Symmetry: C2
Subunit: 135 residues, 2 copies
């Protein structure tokens, strides 16, 4: 009936989408693992993807097009940990982000939506293989 | 100092930004591999990244967000082509996408930029083999 066949994600409500970054950045700034100075700059990067979720639909939003926003943000967060870490370990220090992301979902939704938390982790490992990581 | 901040991002230029997608999408329909149905869908996600590249600049550049917007675009194409590549293989079919990309950059800037072509194709390999795709 009301709420038919659709992939009901935690981004179906703008407030829930906001709470995602609202909690996630709170983890980072309170930890200082990447500097609060960077954490709130990350908020804007994430913000961009959040805002575009309501923009990049055109008029009719197809299933394959709807989830296109997923990997865009994921691949961004993967680099975010690297960006403000000039000298360190992108894997050892991303542990706080692994916790942060899952904690954010735990607070925003309560669901173990940690598959997205998995996506970024492997993407990090990929990026560090190219010179773009060390420049 | 004077010169530490320089936007070499081609997608910050209205013509150059459009040229990328404009050449990409047209090269797809001229190929007919993913059909026009796919090409006329791809432009919506790609456009969104172009739009947000105007947003994320805000009032001052930060070196983190400057590169964060790069990977976001590649990821927007990575999964996107996989969707219309549902049939077993994704590599030999995204080959024509690599063609389109190669053609696009060659026309848009004239630079090889196959590093970005590799960027898109590499993320494909990971996601297309994940059990979130084969459901």
């Amino acid at each position: 009936g009301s709420g038919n066949s659709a992939s009901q994600s935690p981004f179906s409500n703008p407030n829930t989408a906001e709470a995602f970054a609202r909690s996630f950045v709170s983890n980072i700034v309170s930890s200082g693992e990447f500097g609060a100075q960077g954490a709130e700059d990350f908020d804007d990067i994430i913000q961009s993807l959040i805002q575009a979720q309501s923009m990049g639909k055109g008029r009719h939003d197809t299933k394959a097009k709807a989830k296109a926003m997923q990997v865009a943000l994921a691949s961004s967060i993967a680099e975010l940990v690297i960006a403000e870490s000039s000298g360190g370990d992108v894997q050892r220090k991303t542990n706080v982000i692994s916790n942060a992301l899952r904690n954010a979902l735990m607070s925003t939704t309560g669901s173990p939506n940690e598959e997205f938390v998995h996506e970024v982790q492997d993407l990090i490992q990929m990026l560090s293989q190219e010179q773009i990581n060390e420049v």
